[PDB]
Amino acid sequence: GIISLLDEDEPQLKEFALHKLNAVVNDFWAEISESVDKIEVLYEDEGFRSRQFAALVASKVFYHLGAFEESLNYALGAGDLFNVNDNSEYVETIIAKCIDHYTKQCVENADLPEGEKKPIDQRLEGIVNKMFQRCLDDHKYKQAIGIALETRR
Amino acid sequence: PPGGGEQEPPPPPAPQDVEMKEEAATGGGSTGEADGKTAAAAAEHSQRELDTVTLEDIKEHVKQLEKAVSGKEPRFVLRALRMLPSTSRRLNHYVLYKAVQGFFTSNNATRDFLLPFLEEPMDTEADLQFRPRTGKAASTPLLPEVEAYLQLLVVIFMMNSKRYKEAQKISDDLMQKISTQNRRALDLVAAKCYYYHARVYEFLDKLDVVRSFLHARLRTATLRHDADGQATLLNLLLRNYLHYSLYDQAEKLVSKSVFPEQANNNEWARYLYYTGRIKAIQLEYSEARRTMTNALRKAPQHTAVGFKQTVHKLLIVVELLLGEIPDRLQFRQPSLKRSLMPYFLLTQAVRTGNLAKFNQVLDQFGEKFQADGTYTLIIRLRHNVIKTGVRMISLSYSRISLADIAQKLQLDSPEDAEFIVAKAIRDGVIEASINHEKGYVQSKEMIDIYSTREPQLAFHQRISFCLDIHNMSVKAMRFP
Amino acid sequence: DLYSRYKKLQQELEFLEVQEEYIKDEQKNLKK
Amino acid sequence: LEEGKAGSGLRQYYLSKIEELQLIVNDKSQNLRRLQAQRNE
Amino acid sequence: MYEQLKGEWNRKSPNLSKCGEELGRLKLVLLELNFLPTTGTKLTKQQLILARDILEIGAQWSILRKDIPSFERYMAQLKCYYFDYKEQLPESAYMHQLLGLNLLFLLSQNRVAEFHTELERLPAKDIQTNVYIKHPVSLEQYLMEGSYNKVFLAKGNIPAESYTFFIDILLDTIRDEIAGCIEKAYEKILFTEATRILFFNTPKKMTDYAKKRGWVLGPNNYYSFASQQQKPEDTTIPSTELAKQVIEYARQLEMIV
Amino acid sequence: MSEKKQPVDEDNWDDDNVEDDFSNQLRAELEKHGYKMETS
């Protein structure tokens, strides 16, 4: 019944709330399904300092529900706190999906060929070359050329 | 002493024959099956592995004790060793111990001796290819070992066996991942082992954190690699979640998926049993009656033993709440009859229109319902008993007096005589028109619409089912 | 190496994809 | 590598999932090619 | 340490100002221990027991103020306290009826699936004891009757407590059901006979029903005309869907083929 | 099978439904059928 605690006006309880979510989210992934509609309030509020992290728990609960593109949507406006974590499983899934989206968008962009271009968010394209620097740092040479084949750019 | 002394030698070599060549031909066959084909899976020795686990689980398990073949626990867990060309000499060492046990007495080392034994696959360094063969060679003594139920100091060795299995599980997640095929043979084992997790945890403490681990595994199967595993993980979830309040009801709707394909055969139908009780808590019978009936018709051939009978115990519950119930002694089993005697008297008094007859059964036989936790129906079934009585009296009498009907059904007062009928009309129970002056109740018989609507609705199920039989016959016919 | 095979394994996907149209059309004309 | 050695696990998973899906579609093509062999007979 | 907390519980509050100050006082505890998951050292849940008492009276003040979202919030908190993963806690004297407040409100919302799954925690204990829970389950028994009158005899005597605010809602939600469930279908009902169920003496509720129903108002009697009602035949209306069902049925024959 | 869940825990039947109806109702009955004659 921790969902009803989101009715409190002070955001200082909201930071503690998300701190409970991400810890018990493995078993309580289903417990956030009906609260999604209350998460919309925290994400859509600009005066809410934790919206950046609100999109993380939203993207996780959509990972449980089997939502892919819908988790990408919060992935974008989730801020720096989202792409700062390279640990464990959730980081590779989202960049595989985001680069799939990105590379089909880029095969489309090269077919314009120029003019009336689609808007390309700086976050979705910045994690591309940003995480490509991992292939330059680890010196792994087979993946380094693969990404450049994917974006077609 | 001479008689028993000469009857001790014969038994031990019987397993030392079969059990020696059993997982050597099955495990050693699946060793070459795991290198290639590997289609699907199949790995038909995985099905043979179900048969072998169930083979020892009747006779002879592992041990005991018995002071004879208890040395097989360290034997098969030793000597990988190490690479395949080096394993020939070790396969011969397994046979050298047969002459050691034939010449001198056999050595027994178990309990505290199992701690270095279970760590000897990690000491050999290493198998090194097959994690499922090491998981099977380590589990095969451990799985029937739970049958000891000594509960003292060897259950923490079962916890150490879950820890060693978790080491093999880190090796299961990190290694392969591209055409794994070890996971698909290991998902049967992750299934059985996780069920043994809950088995051991039932004798000590329910697992709150192991469900965090289980759900990590659960959600992490999708989408990367799930074959047959997650269908079992969802049933692990549902099994103790049905016994432990709450919310787990609507938890299934967000999990599905379905999850297809249904596996393994009957293993999916039992899932329909668990969710059948669940969906019964929402009082919807039409969805509950089909999921209950499918469970029984989808499960062959038994034995064993009593759980196939219990699923039928709860099968007819939803049909009893429906108001239309077949007589249940057609499914009567000599082992089942003795168990549902009180229950059978329950349904016996339920189909009757006497309300006092029904209230007596709860008083005398409620003590058995406490153990089944079946009181959830006993509050809501009364509605169905009164509806049954009024249905009978409706069709069986043209015109009935509301004051005189209360004495037969022990309705006790004139006022509720109007209430039962009011909701009867509201739910479409009876088409009769009632006049309140005295008052009286008259009823009329209307028909001829009848076979217009009802048979075509059935035909929609009949024909669709017949063409489905045609499709399922064509599917298995085109394989040659 | 990795991306090479990554682009090597949709070929037979599309080849058998047009094979479905192949078999399906041919049996229909073969019935006539 | 994290890009990478484990991100190519999903990447090459597309190879194994396409080959599994295609093994179902190829079983559906094999059992259907028996039709054409038979109808040509 | 900390406090003063329960000092305002015995005296309760004259208005909602002290109640809002009690929530502002509990906000500090919610900043320190939060709500969970502190196992301890279970002595750290002692002040959580002292918080359970003021949350119980926080739902008594949430129904006292009539606010619906506050009531369900505080009830989620209490229910989670008896649902805490540590079942060893000092027995609460309100543990009994605090489930019946949300149960009777839930029944005012007409929730069938949540009712039965509410009692799933202790099925054998709710029958043997806890009269406070035995009144809603007898109310359900009487709701399959239905009642109407039996409930009107049980609505005079309730311990209760705090069920006054809920049994008024139960009142209205029953009274409109008199009007809905009387017809269809009854031929006629005499005047004073319906006046026996509406109670009062000559209420304006039956005049408002003469509007809402409509339906008929007759002299010293009443009528379901006309007729019983709307007279469905349905003649050629079902022949459209009778042809339509056969359309897709023949389609299933062609899918074989 | 015995795998998984189960190790954890004309004919005369159609008329035997009616016989169950006779078991809990009006006995068989001879004696009462013969006792109702002299009552009135």
Side-chain angles (χ1 to χ4, degrees), chain B residues 267-302:
Chain B
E267 199 278 348
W268 176 251
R270 69 182 188 85
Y271 169 70
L272 276 61
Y273 167 61
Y274 286 103
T275 180
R277 182 186 290 99
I278 292 293
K279 297 186 306 298
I281 214 71
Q282 282 77 7
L283 273 67
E284 178 70 15
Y285 309 140
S286 181
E287 178 173 14
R289 58 177 197 93
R290 62 189 189 75
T291 185
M292 288 275 180
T293 309
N294 193 11
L296 176 72
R297 51 177 169 79
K298 197 164 173 292
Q301 179 60 33
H302 80 271

mmCIF file of all heavy atoms in Angstrom, chain B residues 267-302:
data_model
loop_
_atom_site.group_PDB
_atom_site.id
_atom_site.type_symbol
_atom_site.label_atom_id
_atom_site.label_comp_id
_atom_site.label_asym_id
_atom_site.label_seq_id
_atom_site.Cartn_x
_atom_site.Cartn_y
_atom_site.Cartn_z
ATOM 1 N N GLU B 267 2.139 -29.768 -17.233
ATOM 2 C CA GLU B 267 2.692 -28.730 -16.374
ATOM 3 C C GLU B 267 2.006 -27.387 -16.603
ATOM 4 O O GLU B 267 1.954 -26.552 -15.693
ATOM 5 C CB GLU B 267 4.200 -28.616 -16.617
ATOM 6 C CG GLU B 267 4.996 -27.918 -15.517
ATOM 7 C CD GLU B 267 4.961 -26.403 -15.618
ATOM 8 O OE1 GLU B 267 4.520 -25.877 -16.658
ATOM 9 O OE2 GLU B 267 5.390 -25.730 -14.656
ATOM 10 N N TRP B 268 1.471 -27.157 -17.801
ATOM 11 C CA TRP B 268 0.712 -25.938 -18.050
ATOM 12 C C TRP B 268 -0.695 -26.036 -17.464
ATOM 13 O O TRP B 268 -1.209 -25.067 -16.880
ATOM 14 C CB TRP B 268 0.646 -25.672 -19.554
ATOM 15 C CG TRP B 268 -0.184 -24.499 -19.914
ATOM 16 C CD1 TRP B 268 -1.395 -24.515 -20.534
ATOM 17 C CD2 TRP B 268 0.147 -23.125 -19.712
ATOM 18 N NE1 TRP B 268 -1.852 -23.235 -20.716
ATOM 19 C CE2 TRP B 268 -0.922 -22.362 -20.218
ATOM 20 C CE3 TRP B 268 1.241 -22.461 -19.142
ATOM 21 C CZ2 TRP B 268 -0.932 -20.974 -20.171
ATOM 22 C CZ3 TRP B 268 1.232 -21.086 -19.101
ATOM 23 C CH2 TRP B 268 0.154 -20.356 -19.610
ATOM 24 N N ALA B 269 -1.327 -27.201 -17.607
ATOM 25 C CA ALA B 269 -2.679 -27.383 -17.093
ATOM 26 C C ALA B 269 -2.741 -27.146 -15.589
ATOM 27 O O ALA B 269 -3.664 -26.487 -15.095
ATOM 28 C CB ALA B 269 -3.193 -28.778 -17.443
ATOM 29 N N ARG B 270 -1.767 -27.673 -14.839
ATOM 30 C CA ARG B 270 -1.762 -27.413 -13.398
ATOM 31 C C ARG B 270 -1.683 -25.917 -13.112
ATOM 32 O O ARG B 270 -2.317 -25.417 -12.168
ATOM 33 C CB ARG B 270 -0.606 -28.142 -12.718
ATOM 34 C CG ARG B 270 0.758 -27.602 -13.067
ATOM 35 C CD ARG B 270 1.850 -28.393 -12.409
ATOM 36 N NE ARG B 270 3.141 -27.745 -12.594
ATOM 37 C CZ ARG B 270 3.606 -26.775 -11.815
ATOM 38 N NH1 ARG B 270 2.884 -26.325 -10.797
ATOM 39 N NH2 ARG B 270 4.795 -26.246 -12.062
ATOM 40 N N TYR B 271 -0.900 -25.187 -13.913
ATOM 41 C CA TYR B 271 -0.934 -23.733 -13.859
ATOM 42 C C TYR B 271 -2.364 -23.227 -13.992
ATOM 43 O O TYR B 271 -2.796 -22.339 -13.239
ATOM 44 C CB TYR B 271 -0.041 -23.149 -14.954
ATOM 45 C CG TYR B 271 -0.213 -21.668 -15.130
ATOM 46 C CD1 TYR B 271 0.228 -20.787 -14.159
ATOM 47 C CD2 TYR B 271 -0.835 -21.147 -16.257
ATOM 48 C CE1 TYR B 271 0.073 -19.433 -14.304
ATOM 49 C CE2 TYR B 271 -1.001 -19.788 -16.412
ATOM 50 C CZ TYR B 271 -0.543 -18.937 -15.428
ATOM 51 O OH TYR B 271 -0.689 -17.577 -15.546
ATOM 52 N N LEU B 272 -3.128 -23.814 -14.922
ATOM 53 C CA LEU B 272 -4.546 -23.457 -15.008
ATOM 54 C C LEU B 272 -5.313 -23.814 -13.735
ATOM 55 O O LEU B 272 -6.341 -23.196 -13.449
ATOM 56 C CB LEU B 272 -5.222 -24.114 -16.216
ATOM 57 C CG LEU B 272 -5.110 -23.444 -17.588
ATOM 58 C CD1 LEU B 272 -3.670 -23.331 -18.048
ATOM 59 C CD2 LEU B 272 -5.971 -24.175 -18.606
ATOM 60 N N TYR B 273 -4.850 -24.806 -12.966
ATOM 61 C CA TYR B 273 -5.504 -25.093 -11.686
ATOM 62 C C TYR B 273 -5.266 -23.969 -10.682
ATOM 63 O O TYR B 273 -6.218 -23.424 -10.095
ATOM 64 C CB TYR B 273 -5.017 -26.434 -11.131
ATOM 65 C CG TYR B 273 -5.364 -26.706 -9.676
ATOM 66 C CD1 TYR B 273 -6.686 -26.778 -9.257
ATOM 67 C CD2 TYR B 273 -4.367 -26.940 -8.736
ATOM 68 C CE1 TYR B 273 -7.004 -27.046 -7.940
ATOM 69 C CE2 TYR B 273 -4.677 -27.209 -7.415
ATOM 70 C CZ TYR B 273 -5.998 -27.259 -7.025
ATOM 71 O OH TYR B 273 -6.321 -27.524 -5.714
ATOM 72 N N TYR B 274 -3.996 -23.617 -10.470
ATOM 73 C CA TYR B 274 -3.648 -22.516 -9.579
ATOM 74 C C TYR B 274 -4.443 -21.256 -9.928
ATOM 75 O O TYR B 274 -5.165 -20.687 -9.088
ATOM 76 C CB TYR B 274 -2.136 -22.268 -9.655
ATOM 77 C CG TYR B 274 -1.269 -23.302 -8.953
ATOM 78 C CD1 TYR B 274 -0.583 -24.277 -9.676
ATOM 79 C CD2 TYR B 274 -1.142 -23.310 -7.567
ATOM 80 C CE1 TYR B 274 0.205 -25.227 -9.032
ATOM 81 C CE2 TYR B 274 -0.357 -24.250 -6.920
ATOM 82 C CZ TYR B 274 0.311 -25.206 -7.653
ATOM 83 O OH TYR B 274 1.084 -26.137 -6.999
ATOM 84 N N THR B 275 -4.361 -20.827 -11.193
ATOM 85 C CA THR B 275 -5.133 -19.652 -11.577
ATOM 86 C C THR B 275 -6.631 -19.921 -11.573
ATOM 87 O O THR B 275 -7.416 -18.971 -11.629
ATOM 88 C CB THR B 275 -4.733 -19.144 -12.958
ATOM 89 O OG1 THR B 275 -5.528 -17.997 -13.275
ATOM 90 C CG2 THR B 275 -5.001 -20.199 -13.999
ATOM 91 N N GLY B 276 -7.045 -21.187 -11.535
ATOM 92 C CA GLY B 276 -8.467 -21.478 -11.454
ATOM 93 C C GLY B 276 -9.032 -21.121 -10.096
ATOM 94 O O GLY B 276 -10.086 -20.486 -9.990
ATOM 95 N N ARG B 277 -8.328 -21.521 -9.033
ATOM 96 C CA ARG B 277 -8.706 -21.057 -7.701
ATOM 97 C C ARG B 277 -8.635 -19.534 -7.620
ATOM 98 O O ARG B 277 -9.559 -18.878 -7.105
ATOM 99 C CB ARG B 277 -7.800 -21.707 -6.655
ATOM 100 C CG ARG B 277 -8.121 -21.334 -5.214
ATOM 101 C CD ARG B 277 -7.086 -21.902 -4.234
ATOM 102 N NE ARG B 277 -7.150 -23.357 -4.090
ATOM 103 C CZ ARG B 277 -6.345 -24.215 -4.711
ATOM 104 N NH1 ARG B 277 -5.401 -23.777 -5.532
ATOM 105 N NH2 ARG B 277 -6.483 -25.517 -4.505
ATOM 106 N N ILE B 278 -7.559 -18.948 -8.159
ATOM 107 C CA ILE B 278 -7.423 -17.488 -8.148
ATOM 108 C C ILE B 278 -8.653 -16.830 -8.771
ATOM 109 O O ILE B 278 -9.357 -16.053 -8.123
ATOM 110 C CB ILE B 278 -6.128 -17.052 -8.859
ATOM 111 C CG1 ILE B 278 -4.915 -17.487 -8.039
ATOM 112 C CG2 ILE B 278 -6.138 -15.550 -9.095
ATOM 113 C CD1 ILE B 278 -4.798 -16.775 -6.708
ATOM 114 N N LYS B 279 -8.937 -17.150 -10.038
ATOM 115 C CA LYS B 279 -10.070 -16.565 -10.747
ATOM 116 C C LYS B 279 -11.403 -16.946 -10.127
ATOM 117 O O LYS B 279 -12.417 -16.303 -10.425
ATOM 118 C CB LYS B 279 -10.064 -17.011 -12.202
ATOM 119 C CG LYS B 279 -8.858 -16.559 -12.981
ATOM 120 C CD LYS B 279 -9.032 -16.924 -14.429
ATOM 121 C CE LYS B 279 -9.320 -18.410 -14.551
ATOM 122 N NZ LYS B 279 -8.207 -19.249 -14.046
ATOM 123 N N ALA B 280 -11.433 -18.000 -9.312
ATOM 124 C CA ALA B 280 -12.620 -18.270 -8.513
ATOM 125 C C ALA B 280 -12.805 -17.219 -7.425
ATOM 126 O O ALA B 280 -13.945 -16.889 -7.081
ATOM 127 C CB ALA B 280 -12.552 -19.671 -7.905
ATOM 128 N N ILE B 281 -11.714 -16.673 -6.878
ATOM 129 C CA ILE B 281 -11.897 -15.631 -5.866
ATOM 130 C C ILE B 281 -12.609 -14.396 -6.426
ATOM 131 O O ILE B 281 -13.192 -13.623 -5.655
ATOM 132 C CB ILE B 281 -10.554 -15.231 -5.221
ATOM 133 C CG1 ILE B 281 -10.758 -14.862 -3.754
ATOM 134 C CG2 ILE B 281 -9.953 -14.035 -5.922
ATOM 135 C CD1 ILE B 281 -11.072 -16.052 -2.889
ATOM 136 N N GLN B 282 -12.577 -14.178 -7.745
ATOM 137 C CA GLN B 282 -13.320 -13.082 -8.364
ATOM 138 C C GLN B 282 -14.768 -13.445 -8.663
ATOM 139 O O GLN B 282 -15.498 -12.623 -9.228
ATOM 140 C CB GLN B 282 -12.632 -12.606 -9.658
ATOM 141 C CG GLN B 282 -11.400 -11.712 -9.457
ATOM 142 C CD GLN B 282 -10.164 -12.485 -9.042
ATOM 143 O OE1 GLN B 282 -10.167 -13.712 -9.028
ATOM 144 N NE2 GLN B 282 -9.100 -11.770 -8.703
ATOM 145 N N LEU B 283 -15.188 -14.658 -8.301
ATOM 146 C CA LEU B 283 -16.554 -15.168 -8.396
ATOM 147 C C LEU B 283 -17.026 -15.404 -9.824
ATOM 148 O O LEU B 283 -18.208 -15.701 -10.025
ATOM 149 C CB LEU B 283 -17.568 -14.261 -7.684
ATOM 150 C CG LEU B 283 -17.784 -14.531 -6.193
ATOM 151 C CD1 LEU B 283 -16.532 -14.209 -5.391
ATOM 152 C CD2 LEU B 283 -18.991 -13.779 -5.658
ATOM 153 N N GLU B 284 -16.154 -15.291 -10.821
ATOM 154 C CA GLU B 284 -16.540 -15.591 -12.196
ATOM 155 C C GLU B 284 -16.332 -17.080 -12.449
ATOM 156 O O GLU B 284 -15.194 -17.560 -12.481
ATOM 157 C CB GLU B 284 -15.761 -14.742 -13.193
ATOM 158 C CG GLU B 284 -16.103 -15.069 -14.640
ATOM 159 C CD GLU B 284 -17.508 -14.636 -15.035
ATOM 160 O OE1 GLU B 284 -18.128 -13.841 -14.295
ATOM 161 O OE2 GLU B 284 -17.997 -15.097 -16.089
ATOM 162 N N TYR B 285 -17.438 -17.804 -12.638
ATOM 163 C CA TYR B 285 -17.432 -19.256 -12.778
ATOM 164 C C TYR B 285 -17.220 -19.696 -14.219
ATOM 165 O O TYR B 285 -16.547 -20.703 -14.465
ATOM 166 C CB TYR B 285 -18.754 -19.840 -12.275
ATOM 167 C CG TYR B 285 -19.172 -19.383 -10.895
ATOM 168 C CD1 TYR B 285 -20.506 -19.097 -10.621
ATOM 169 C CD2 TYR B 285 -18.245 -19.216 -9.876
ATOM 170 C CE1 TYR B 285 -20.906 -18.672 -9.370
ATOM 171 C CE2 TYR B 285 -18.636 -18.790 -8.617
ATOM 172 C CZ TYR B 285 -19.967 -18.516 -8.373
ATOM 173 O OH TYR B 285 -20.360 -18.097 -7.123
ATOM 174 N N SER B 286 -17.815 -18.973 -15.173
ATOM 175 C CA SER B 286 -17.686 -19.330 -16.584
ATOM 176 C C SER B 286 -16.226 -19.388 -17.005
ATOM 177 O O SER B 286 -15.817 -20.291 -17.746
ATOM 178 C CB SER B 286 -18.457 -18.335 -17.449
ATOM 179 O OG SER B 286 -18.367 -18.663 -18.827
ATOM 180 N N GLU B 287 -15.426 -18.430 -16.547
ATOM 181 C CA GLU B 287 -13.994 -18.501 -16.780
ATOM 182 C C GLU B 287 -13.343 -19.553 -15.893
ATOM 183 O O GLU B 287 -12.342 -20.165 -16.286
ATOM 184 C CB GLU B 287 -13.368 -17.128 -16.544
ATOM 185 C CG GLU B 287 -11.866 -17.075 -16.712
ATOM 186 C CD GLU B 287 -11.327 -15.663 -16.644
ATOM 187 O OE1 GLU B 287 -12.077 -14.764 -16.208
ATOM 188 O OE2 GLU B 287 -10.155 -15.450 -17.022
ATOM 189 N N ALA B 288 -13.918 -19.805 -14.714
ATOM 190 C CA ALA B 288 -13.334 -20.763 -13.779
ATOM 191 C C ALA B 288 -13.672 -22.207 -14.136
ATOM 192 O O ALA B 288 -12.834 -23.099 -13.952
ATOM 193 C CB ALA B 288 -13.797 -20.451 -12.354
ATOM 194 N N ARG B 289 -14.879 -22.460 -14.651
ATOM 195 C CA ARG B 289 -15.288 -23.832 -14.937
ATOM 196 C C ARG B 289 -14.451 -24.455 -16.052
ATOM 197 O O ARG B 289 -14.093 -25.639 -15.973
ATOM 198 C CB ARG B 289 -16.780 -23.879 -15.279
ATOM 199 C CG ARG B 289 -17.222 -23.023 -16.462
ATOM 200 C CD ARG B 289 -18.711 -23.221 -16.728
ATOM 201 N NE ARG B 289 -19.103 -22.761 -18.057
ATOM 202 C CZ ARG B 289 -19.146 -23.538 -19.134
ATOM 203 N NH1 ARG B 289 -18.827 -24.819 -19.036
ATOM 204 N NH2 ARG B 289 -19.514 -23.032 -20.304
ATOM 205 N N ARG B 290 -14.110 -23.678 -17.084
ATOM 206 C CA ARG B 290 -13.313 -24.190 -18.196
ATOM 207 C C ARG B 290 -11.867 -24.445 -17.785
ATOM 208 O O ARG B 290 -11.279 -25.461 -18.177
ATOM 209 C CB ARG B 290 -13.358 -23.220 -19.373
ATOM 210 C CG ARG B 290 -12.789 -21.848 -19.079
ATOM 211 C CD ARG B 290 -13.068 -20.875 -20.202
ATOM 212 N NE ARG B 290 -12.343 -19.626 -19.997
ATOM 213 C CZ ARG B 290 -11.035 -19.488 -20.189
ATOM 214 N NH1 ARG B 290 -10.312 -20.522 -20.597
ATOM 215 N NH2 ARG B 290 -10.451 -18.319 -19.972
ATOM 216 N N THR B 291 -11.268 -23.524 -17.021
ATOM 217 C CA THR B 291 -9.900 -23.731 -16.555
ATOM 218 C C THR B 291 -9.818 -24.906 -15.594
ATOM 219 O O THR B 291 -8.812 -25.625 -15.585
ATOM 220 C CB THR B 291 -9.334 -22.454 -15.921
ATOM 221 O OG1 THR B 291 -7.957 -22.654 -15.575
ATOM 222 C CG2 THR B 291 -10.088 -22.062 -14.672
ATOM 223 N N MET B 292 -10.863 -25.141 -14.799
ATOM 224 C CA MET B 292 -10.846 -26.311 -13.929
ATOM 225 C C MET B 292 -10.977 -27.595 -14.741
ATOM 226 O O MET B 292 -10.185 -28.530 -14.568
ATOM 227 C CB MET B 292 -11.951 -26.209 -12.878
ATOM 228 C CG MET B 292 -11.652 -25.158 -11.823
ATOM 229 S SD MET B 292 -10.613 -25.763 -10.480
ATOM 230 C CE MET B 292 -10.500 -24.285 -9.479
ATOM 231 N N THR B 293 -11.952 -27.651 -15.654
ATOM 232 C CA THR B 293 -12.172 -28.878 -16.422
ATOM 233 C C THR B 293 -10.964 -29.220 -17.295
ATOM 234 O O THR B 293 -10.577 -30.396 -17.419
ATOM 235 C CB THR B 293 -13.440 -28.734 -17.264
ATOM 236 O OG1 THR B 293 -14.519 -28.291 -16.428
ATOM 237 C CG2 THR B 293 -13.820 -30.062 -17.908
ATOM 238 N N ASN B 294 -10.347 -28.199 -17.897
ATOM 239 C CA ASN B 294 -9.173 -28.426 -18.734
ATOM 240 C C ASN B 294 -8.038 -29.062 -17.945
ATOM 241 O O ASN B 294 -7.277 -29.873 -18.484
ATOM 242 C CB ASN B 294 -8.703 -27.111 -19.358
ATOM 243 C CG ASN B 294 -7.698 -27.328 -20.478
ATOM 244 O OD1 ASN B 294 -7.496 -28.451 -20.939
ATOM 245 N ND2 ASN B 294 -7.051 -26.252 -20.910
ATOM 246 N N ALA B 295 -7.903 -28.697 -16.670
ATOM 247 C CA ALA B 295 -6.832 -29.253 -15.852
ATOM 248 C C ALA B 295 -6.925 -30.770 -15.787
ATOM 249 O O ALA B 295 -5.926 -31.476 -15.969
ATOM 250 C CB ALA B 295 -6.877 -28.647 -14.449
ATOM 251 N N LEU B 296 -8.130 -31.293 -15.559
ATOM 252 C CA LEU B 296 -8.280 -32.737 -15.420
ATOM 253 C C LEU B 296 -8.166 -33.431 -16.773
ATOM 254 O O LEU B 296 -7.467 -34.442 -16.898
ATOM 255 C CB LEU B 296 -9.610 -33.068 -14.738
ATOM 256 C CG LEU B 296 -9.995 -34.543 -14.587
ATOM 257 C CD1 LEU B 296 -9.133 -35.216 -13.527
ATOM 258 C CD2 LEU B 296 -11.472 -34.674 -14.237
ATOM 259 N N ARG B 297 -8.826 -32.898 -17.813
ATOM 260 C CA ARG B 297 -8.733 -33.627 -19.082
ATOM 261 C C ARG B 297 -7.360 -33.503 -19.737
ATOM 262 O O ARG B 297 -7.046 -34.302 -20.625
ATOM 263 C CB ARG B 297 -9.803 -33.175 -20.075
ATOM 264 C CG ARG B 297 -9.893 -31.688 -20.289
ATOM 265 C CD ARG B 297 -10.935 -31.368 -21.347
ATOM 266 N NE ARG B 297 -11.239 -29.943 -21.399
ATOM 267 C CZ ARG B 297 -10.472 -29.036 -21.995
ATOM 268 N NH1 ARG B 297 -9.342 -29.400 -22.587
ATOM 269 N NH2 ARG B 297 -10.831 -27.760 -21.993
ATOM 270 N N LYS B 298 -6.541 -32.539 -19.320
ATOM 271 C CA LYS B 298 -5.213 -32.351 -19.894
ATOM 272 C C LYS B 298 -4.130 -33.123 -19.149
ATOM 273 O O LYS B 298 -2.968 -33.094 -19.566
ATOM 274 C CB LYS B 298 -4.859 -30.862 -19.925
ATOM 275 C CG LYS B 298 -3.706 -30.501 -20.860
ATOM 276 C CD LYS B 298 -3.647 -29.009 -21.151
ATOM 277 C CE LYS B 298 -2.389 -28.658 -21.934
ATOM 278 N NZ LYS B 298 -1.158 -28.842 -21.123
ATOM 279 N N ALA B 299 -4.476 -33.826 -18.073
ATOM 280 C CA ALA B 299 -3.500 -34.533 -17.241
ATOM 281 C C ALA B 299 -3.701 -36.039 -17.332
ATOM 282 O O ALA B 299 -4.658 -36.579 -16.748
ATOM 283 C CB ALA B 299 -3.602 -34.080 -15.789
ATOM 284 N N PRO B 300 -2.855 -36.761 -18.079
ATOM 285 C CA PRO B 300 -2.740 -38.217 -18.008
ATOM 286 C C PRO B 300 -1.417 -38.600 -17.346
ATOM 287 O O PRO B 300 -0.608 -37.707 -17.103
ATOM 288 C CB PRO B 300 -2.771 -38.636 -19.482
ATOM 289 C CG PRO B 300 -2.245 -37.425 -20.238
ATOM 290 C CD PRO B 300 -2.188 -36.244 -19.284
ATOM 291 N N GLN B 301 -1.204 -39.866 -17.003
ATOM 292 C CA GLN B 301 -2.237 -40.883 -16.941
ATOM 293 C C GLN B 301 -2.297 -41.278 -15.480
ATOM 294 O O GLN B 301 -3.056 -42.160 -15.086
ATOM 295 C CB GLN B 301 -1.902 -42.077 -17.850
ATOM 296 C CG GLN B 301 -2.920 -43.212 -17.846
ATOM 297 C CD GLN B 301 -4.299 -42.771 -18.294
ATOM 298 O OE1 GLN B 301 -4.435 -41.886 -19.139
ATOM 299 N NE2 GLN B 301 -5.331 -43.372 -17.714
ATOM 300 N N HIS B 302 -1.465 -40.591 -14.688
ATOM 301 C CA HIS B 302 -1.135 -40.956 -13.308
ATOM 302 C C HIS B 302 -0.657 -42.425 -13.373
ATOM 303 O O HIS B 302 -0.362 -42.901 -14.470
ATOM 304 C CB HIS B 302 -2.339 -40.703 -12.367
ATOM 305 C CG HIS B 302 -3.393 -41.768 -12.391
ATOM 306 N ND1 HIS B 302 -4.455 -41.751 -13.271
ATOM 307 C CD2 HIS B 302 -3.563 -42.869 -11.619
ATOM 308 C CE1 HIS B 302 -5.224 -42.804 -13.050
ATOM 309 N NE2 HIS B 302 -4.704 -43.498 -12.054
#
